[PDB]
Symmetry: D3
Subunit: 160 residues, 6 copies
C-alpha cells in the first residue's frame, strides 16, 4: 500500500461496546485509526466534549493504533489534511442505511477522493445506541453489558 | 502493514458500470483485488461462466491489481485458500441492505476471520443492475451509458 | 391543456379494484387514458394476453375515455408513438416504492420527456394484489369485494 | 385447552429460528398447533410427510405442541379447532411488509382471528430454511442452525 | 388474573388506533393494563392526569382493562404484577424498526417478558396522536379519529 | 380539458434545485402552479417567511405559470378556495414515502376531492435537502451545484 489511515467519526455520548466492536474490527485493517468527534456541534449531549474524549481515551487504551481527535470543519477536510482515504461507519438498521446514504452522497460531492466504508453491527450489539443506554442508566439498571467499565462509572455518577 | 487481498463476489451477468465503479473504488485501498465468480451455480443465466470471466477481464485490464477468478464451494473458503480477510459488496437500496445483512451474518458464523465491508453505489449507477440492463438490451435501446464497451458489444450480439 | 394522454401499464393478471381505483382517479385528468400491457412477455401468469385485455375492457366499460392496448417494445416508445407524456403508477407499500424508483430512473435515461406520476393506493385497497386475489380464489372464498363482477366470473371458472 | 394458538409455515425444514418462536409461545396458550399446508405445490426440498416428521421430532420436548396439516384456508383451520390466534415471527422489514398484506386479507376472511407477531431473537434473525440449505449443499456444518435430527435429514439429502 | 398483558404508551391523547389494539386484546388475556409513564419529559400536550382520565373513560366499557401510572422500567412493572406479555401496535415500517430496538433491549432487561405485536387495522393505519392534534388546531372534524370524550378535550384545548 | 391548478406545498428553507426540478417537471402538466408556504408555522427555520417567499419568486420567474403564495389554515382548505384539485410532492427515499403516505391518508379524509400526486427525485438531486445544504453552507463550502444563484448568495451572506 502506502501508509494507511481511517477515520471513525461519531458523537460517542457515551461510547458503547457497539462503537467499540467497530473500532476493534478496524484495528488490524489499518495502520492508524483516528476516532474523531465534533467541536461546537451546537447540539448538547448528556456529556461534554472533554468527558466524551476522555471516555473514549480510557475505553480504547488496550488498542495501541487508535488515536482520538476533534475537529472543527468538514470531516472530509480532516481526512484530506491528515492522510486518510477511508471513513468507517457502522450500520445497525435500515434507518442507519438511509441516513448514511444521503451523507456519503454529499461527502462524495465535497471530496471525491474519500471513500466511506460500512460495517454491519454484529448481532449482539445492533440494538445498542447511546440514547437507549443513557435511558436505561436513568433508571439505574445494570448497564455493564452495554458500555465499558469507565463509561459505566461515568453514567452511575451522572444519574444519581 | 501486511499484505491485503479483498474478494469482490458476484454473478456479473454481465458486469456493468455499477459493478466497475465498486471495483475501481477499492483498488487503491487493498493491495490485491480478487473478482470472484461462482463456478457452476445451478442458477444458470444469460452468459456462460467463461463469457462472464472474459467480459470482466476485458473491462478490468486498465487496473493492474485486479485479478478475475472462478470457484465452486463456499465463498469464505475461497478467501481462506487465497488469504483474503475482506469481502466487498455494493449497496444500491434498502432491499440490498437487508439481503446483505442476512448473508454477512451467516458468513460470519461460517468463518469469523473474514470481514465484509460495503460501499454505497454512486448516485449515477444506483439504479443499474444486470437484470434491468438485459431487458433494455432486448429491446435494443442504447446501453453505452450502463455497461463498458466490451460488454456492450456482447449484449447487442446476444440480443441481435 | 393540450390533447393529453396518460399511459397506465401493468400485467393486470387479473385487473382488480386496486387497479381500477387508480384508473378512475386518473380519467378526469387527461383527455384519454391508455391501459397498456406488454405483448410477448415470456413471463406467463395465469390468464393469456387475450383474456387479460378482455377483462380490462369489460371492467372499464363505464368510463368513456379509457382504452386498452398492447405493445410490442419499450413503454417509453409506446408513449412516444401515441403522443403521451405521462405514465401513471400506483404505490401500496415500500416494496412498491423501491421497485418503482429503479424503473423510473431507467425510464428517465431512456426518454427524459416522459414523466411518471405516482398515486397512493386508497386505504381499503392497499393490501390488494392480483396474486393474493388468485390465492383466495383457489379456495373459492368470496372475492366480490376485490375484483369487479366480470373478473370474478373469470376467476371462479379458472379455479374449478 | 381453553386457549389455542396456530403457528403456520412451510418449515422446509424447520430451524432453530422457527423453534425459538414456538418455544416462546408454549407457555402463553394451553395448546400450540404447528400447521403445514397440504397440497401446496412447488416442493421440494422435502415432502409434506418428511416435513411433518421433522417438526414433530424437533418439538417432542414441548408437551403442549401438536403438528397438523390442512388443505384449506388457515382461518378455517382455526375456527375448526377453536383457535383465536395465529402466531408469526418477524426478522426484518421485508417480513413485516409481507405479513402486513397477509393479515389484512386474513381479516376480511375472518374478523375474529388475530395474528400476533414476535420478533426473532437477535441470534436467529439471519436464519431461513433457504440459507441453511445453501450451506448444507456445500457440506458445511449446520448444527448451530437446526436441531440434530434435522441436521441428519439435510446431510442425507445433500450427501 | 392468571394472565396479564401490559399495553404501554404516551396516549397524548388516546385515539381510535390505540383503542382498537386494546379492544383486540381483551378477549385474549384475563387482564389488560394500559400503562403510562410517571415523570416523563417533552410534553404537552395533555398532562399525566388529563391523559389518564381520557384513557379511563375511553375504555370503561371493557371490564378487564385498568389504567395505571408507573415511574420505573416497563419491564419492572410487568414482573411485579405478574404480566409476562407486553402488547404493542405496528402501523408502518418506521414503527417496526423502532420497536425492534426496544424489544431487543427489554429482552436484555428481563428475559421472561415477551413483546407481542398487532398490525393496525387498515382503517386506522395513518392515525397518530400527533396528527390528530395537528387537525384539531385548525378546527377540523376529528370524530372519525378519537372517541367522543377525547373529542371534547381536543375541541377545548385548541378552540 | 377544464382549467387545472396544482399546489406544491413546502417549507422551502431554502428552495434547492431538488425542489425546483419538481416544480419544473410540473409546469407543462397543469395550467397554474401555486407554490404555497405555511404562514405562521411555529417551528421557525433559518429564513423568515418573507425571505423564503422572495427566494422562490426569483427562482421561478422564467416559468410564467408559477406563482408563490402563503396560507394560514389547512392545505386542503387552500386548495378548495382557489379550485386546485391536485397537490404535488416529491420523494427521494423510503422515509419520504412513509411520511407522505400518512399525510395523504389524512388529507383524503379532510377532503376527498383533492388528489396528491408524487414524483421521484431525479438521481442527481436524490440526496439534496435544505437541511444538508445549510450545514454544508455553514462550513463555507461551494453549494452552487445544489441551489440556484440567488439562493447561493443569501446563504453566503447568512453564514459569512
Ligand atoms: C459520513 C460521515 C459524516 C458524518 C456527519 S455527521 C452529521 N450529519 C448531519 C449533521 C449536521 O446536520 O450537523 N452532522 N456529517 C458528515 C458531513 C455530511 C455532509 C455535510 C458535512 C458533514 C460534516 O463533515 N460535518 C462535520 C463533521 C466533523 C467531524 C465529525 Cl467527527 C463529523 Cl461526524 C462531522 N459526514
Ligand atoms: C456476500 C457474498 C456472498 C454471496 C452469496 S450469493 C448467494 N446467496 C444465496 C444464494 C443462493 O441460494 O443461490 N446465492 N452467497 C454468499 C454465502 C452466503 C451464506 C451461505 C453461503 C453463500 C456462498 O458462499 N455461496 C457460494 C458462493 C461461492 C462463490 C461466490 Cl463468488 C458466491 Cl457469490 C457464492 N456470500
Ligand atoms: C414503470 C412502468 C414500467 C413498467 C415495467 S414492468 C416490467 N416488466 C419487466 C420489468 C423488469 O425486468 O424490470 N419491469 N417496465 C418498465 C421499463 C423499465 C425500464 C426497463 C424497460 C421496461 C419496459 O419498458 N418494459 C417494457 C414494458 C413493460 C410494461 C408494459 Cl405495459 C409495456 Cl407496453 C412495456 N416500465
Ligand atoms: C398468516 C399466515 C398465512 C400464511 C400464508 S402462506 C406463507 N407465508 C410465508 C410462507 C413461506 O415462507 O413459505 N408461506 N398464507 C396465508 C393466507 C394469506 C391470505 C390468503 C389466504 C392464505 C391462506 O390461508 N393460505 C392457506 C394456508 C397457508 C399456510 C398454512 Cl400452514 C395453511 Cl394450513 C394454509 N396466511
Ligand atoms: C416496548 C415498550 C417500551 C416503550 C418505551 S417508550 C420510550 N420512552 C423513551 C424511549 C426511548 O428513549 O427510546 N422509549 N420504552 C421502553 C423501554 C425500552 C428499553 C429501555 C427502557 C424503556 C422503558 O422501559 N421505559 C420506561 C417506560 C415505562 C412505562 C411506560 Cl408505559 C413507558 Cl411508555 C416507558 N419500552
Ligand atoms: C402533503 C401536503 C401536506 C404537508 C403538510 S406539512 C406537516 N405535516 C405535519 C406537520 C406538523 O405536525 O407540524 N406539518 N401537512 C399537510 C396536512 C396533513 C394533514 C394534517 C394537516 C396538514 C396541513 O394541511 N397543514 C397546514 C399546511 C398549510 C400550508 C402548507 Cl404549504 C402546508 Cl405544507 C401545511 N399536508
Ligand atoms: N451498536 C452499534 N453497532 C454498530 N455501529 C454503531 C452502533 N452504535 C452506533 N453505531 C454507529 O457508530 C457511528 C457513530 O455513532 P453515533 O454518532 O455515536 O450514534 P448517534 O446517532 O449520534 O447517536 P446513537 O449512538 O445512534 S444514540 C454511526 O455510524 C452509528 O450508526
Ligand atoms: N449499480 C451498482 N452499484 C453498486 N453496487 C452494485 C451495483 N450493481 C450491483 N452491485 C452489487 O455488486 C454485488 C454483486 O452484484 P451481482 O450479484 O453480480 O448482481 P445480482 O444481484 O446477482 O443481479 P443484479 O441484476 O446486478 S441485482 C452485489 O452486492 C450487488 O448489490
Ligand atoms: N391495490 C392497488 N392499489 C394501488 N395500486 C396498485 C394496486 N395493485 C397494483 N397496483 C399498481 O398498478 C401497477 C400495476 O401492477 P401490476 O403489474 O398489474 O401487478 P403486479 O404488481 O405485477 O402483480 P401484483 O400481484 O398486482 S403485486 C403497479 O404500479 C402496481 O403497484
Ligand atoms: N429465524 C426466524 N426467526 C423468527 N421467525 C422466523 C424465522 N424464520 C422464519 N420465521 C417465521 O416463520 C414463519 C413461517 O416460516 P416460513 O414460511 O417456513 O418462512 P420461510 O419460507 O421458511 O423463509 P424461507 O428460507 O424463504 S423458505 C414466518 O412468519 C417466518 O417469518
Ligand atoms: N393507529 C394505530 N394503530 C395501531 N397502533 C397504534 C396506532 N397509533 C399508535 N399506535 C401504537 O401505540 C403505541 C403507544 O402509543 P404512543 O407511544 O403514543 O405512540 P407514539 O408514536 O409514541 O405517539 P404517536 O406516534 O403521536 S401515536 C405505539 O407503540 C404505536 O405503535
Ligand atoms: N431533492 C429533492 N428532490 C425532489 N423532491 C424533493 C427534494 N427535496 C425535497 N423534496 C420534496 O418537496 C417537499 C419538501 O419541501 P421541504 O421538505 O419543506 O424542504 P427539504 O428539501 O425536504 O429539506 P428538509 O424539508 O429540511 S428534509 C417534499 O415533498 C419533499 O420530499
Amino acid at each position: 500500500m502506502e501508509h494507511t489511515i481511517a477515520v471513525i467519526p461519531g458523537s460517542f455520548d457515551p461510547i458503547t461496546y457497539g462503537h467499540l466492536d467497530i473500532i476493534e474490527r478496524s484495528t488490524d485493517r489499518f495502520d492508524e485509526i483516528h476516532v474523531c468527534v465534533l467541536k461546537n456541534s451546537k447540539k448538547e449531549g448528556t456529556f461534554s466534549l472533554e468527558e466524551r474524549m476522555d471516555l473514549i481515551e480510557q475505553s480504547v487504551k488496550h488498542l495501541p493504533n487508535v488515536k482520538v481527535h476533534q475537529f472543527s470543519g468538514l470531516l472530509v477536510d480532516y481526512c484530506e489534511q491528515v492522510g486518510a482515504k477511508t471513513i468507517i461507519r457502522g450500520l445497525r438498521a435500515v434507518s442507519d442505511f438511509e441516513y448514511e446514504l444521503r451523507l456519503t452522497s454529499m461527502n462524495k460531492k465535497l471530496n471525491n477522493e474519500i471513500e466511506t466504508l460500512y460495517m454491519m453491527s454484529s448481532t449482539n450489539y445492533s440494538f445498542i445506541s447511546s440514547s437507549i443506554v443513557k435511558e436505561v442508566a436513568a433508571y439505574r439498571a445494570d448497564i455493564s453489558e452495554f458500555v465499558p467499565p469507565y463509561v459505566e462509572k461515568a453514567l452511575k455518577k451522572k444519574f444519581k
